[PDB]
Design a protein around this nucleic acid. Structure first.
Ligand SMILES: [Mg+2]
Ligand SMILES: [Mg+2]
Length: 58
RNA sequence: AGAAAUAACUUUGCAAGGAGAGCCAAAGCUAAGACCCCCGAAACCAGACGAGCUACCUAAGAACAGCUAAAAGAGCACACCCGU
């Protein structure tokens, strides 16, 4: 084929070369820094923030 | 001191079928990736431990000078007790 000819002049494939397909492994989000975490997205004081808002549909 | 589903979005496989039984299917299924904090009440209920402090009670013991007065929850006043 065409690509199979490309592989001949590249380095050997091994577990040091692999990669995920771009766009698959979305990066993670952690509350650290001035953007992600100062209130970590939970908003001002209120039962929204503490994780105590009424049941779904109240 | 940011743990996780329901959908959605992205990338793969296979595609009228997907999935290694059960499930879904009028382009859908299978897989992965992403997203939901920490400290703090007065309390409540159950079972234990406490009357060597203090409140009261029981058994058997102990103390209460001297003076005045004689059988009195008597007067002055030590030990003793209390705490204006
Ligand atoms: Mg996380
Ligand atoms: Mg006693």
């Amino acid at each position: 084929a065409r690509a199979l000819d490309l592989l001949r002049g590249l380095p050997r494939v091994s577990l040091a070369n692999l990669k995920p397909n771009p766009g698959s492994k979305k990066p993670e989000r952690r509350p650290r820094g001035r953007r992600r975490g100062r209130k970590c997205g939970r908003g001002h004081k209120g039962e929204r923030q503490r994780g105590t808002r009424p049941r779904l549909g109240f």
